[PDB]
Amino acid sequence: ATNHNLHITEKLEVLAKAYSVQGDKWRALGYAKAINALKSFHKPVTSYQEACSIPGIGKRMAEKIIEILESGHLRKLDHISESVPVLELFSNIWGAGTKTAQMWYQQGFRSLEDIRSQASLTTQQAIGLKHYSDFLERMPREEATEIEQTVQKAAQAFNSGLLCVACGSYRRGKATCGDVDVLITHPDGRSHRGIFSRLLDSLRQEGFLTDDLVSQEENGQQQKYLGVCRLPGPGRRHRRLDIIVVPYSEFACALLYFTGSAHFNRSMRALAKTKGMSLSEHALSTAVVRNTHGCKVGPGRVLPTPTEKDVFRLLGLPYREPAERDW
DNA sequence: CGGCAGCGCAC
DNA sequence: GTGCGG
DNA sequence: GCCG
Ligand SMILES: C[As](C)(=O)[O-]
Ligand SMILES: [Cl-]
Ligand code: NA
Ligand code: NA
Ligand code: NA
């Protein structure tokens, strides 16, 4: 759906990113929601009244929208800190957010070279830095597919009945992907256990995993690995690879969560809430039990969901294909 | 105004 | 406990 | 930033 408000959304995106790299996460979020509404409007917004009719756009946002529409410029951009470009440069490093970016800037650092030379780095950030270029580029989905295949092959060597699926933008059908999330489980509900570790050993021993960002993360019965891989062959770049092993009873919700997008997941939690339910990568549950003070005193009951559609059904929603989950 | 999810990790 | 990314 |  062509954007009939590009000259607007463009300027709005610049201001958004600026708030984002400076810590104003919520304000940046608000902008993002309005920016999406605009991109997909059935016509170029021509009035402040029209703008306000679109959910996600309030008085403040309409003000700016109409200013750009009529004047062609956004005065606020003219007051955006000189630091923004550098804060964005530094935050492009995996492991460094706004606080770290700000710290570096205040220490006089300006280039990725200053960072490499005089900045204190965490293990993750150091890895993020030497793979700056590689990590900044989105890979063709074909490469994501080879990466998924590499993991699945090494995994089925331990148990042929294991189920492996690449999620993220890749599962949403995007031509290119920023990383790869391989979700693994087993239909028998139990044989996924004792797979995670030896799967990582195997992949390391075959030279596929080049660096670890988080070797192991335990979230309930989910085991997650955040790392870096590089397919065999010359000319291959290093890529962000995540591996998640979950028990079959949480497969659908894990699938839903890791497929995203982040905006989709957020809209689904909001909906679940209105129905008195909660949604996580673990399950769809009835809302938690809380005392008079309004505080969790007892967990909700998990509502079984064998497949993704079971999740939509219980939320009273029509199923949406992965391809239609950008928002 | 408070909520916009909750999480586990490195540090 | 904070920063960060999923 | 927006929403209720
Ligand atoms: C427009 As209102 C009720 O969010 O202040
Ligand atoms: Cl499913
Ligand atoms: Na970053
Ligand atoms: Na506020
Ligand atoms: Na977060």
Task: Record the tokens describing residue A103, joined without a space.
Answer: 């710290």
**Nearby residues for ligand 3 (ion, Cβ within 5 Å):** A 91, 96
Secondary structure (3-state) at A289: strand
Method by which the model was determined: X-ray
Nearest ligand, CA A96: 3
CA–CA gap between residue A181 and residue A214 (Å, rounded)? 14
Nearest ligand, CA A305: 2
Distance in Å from B2's C1' to A40's CA comes to 30
**Alpha helices, DSSP H, located in chain A:** 6-21, 25-39, 48-53, 59-71, 84-91, 98-106, 112-118, 123-130, 132-136, 141-156, 168-171, 196-205, 251-259, 262-274, 308-314
Task: Record the tokens describing residue A165, joined without a space.
Answer: 């699926």
| Per-residue exposure over A224-249, b if at least 16 CB sit within 10 Å of its own CB, e if not | bbbbbbbbeeeeeebbbbbbbbbbbb
Structural domains in chain A plus CATH codes: 1-83 (1.10.150.110), 84-137 (1.10.150.20), 138-260 (3.30.460.10), 261-327 (3.30.210.10)
Q: Kindly give the distance from the C-alpha atom of residue A92 to the centroid of ligand 3, in angstroms, as a whole number.
A: 5
β partners of residue A242: A181, A226
Distance set, CA A169 to CA A104, A131, A151, A181 (Å): 31, 21, 18, 9
**Where is chain A broken, named by the residue before each break, C–N > 2.5 Å?**
none
Q: What is the DSSP letter of A287?
A: P
Report the half-sphere exposure of A294 (CA within 13 A, side-chain side). Answer: 0
Secondary structure (3-state) at A176: strand
Burial classification of residue A140, based on how many CB atoms lie within 10 Å of its CB (0-12 exposed, 13-18 middle, 19 or more buried): exposed
CA–CA gap between residue A75 and residue A97 (Å, rounded)? 27
Catalytic residues of A: 64
**Alpha helices, DSSP H, located in A119-261:** 123-130, 132-136, 141-156, 168-171, 196-205, 251-259
Name the strands in the sheet holding A180-185, side by side, starting at the edge strand that comes first in the sequence: A163-166, A180-185, A239-245, A222-229, A209-219
Residue nearest to nucleotide B8 (CA to C1'): A217
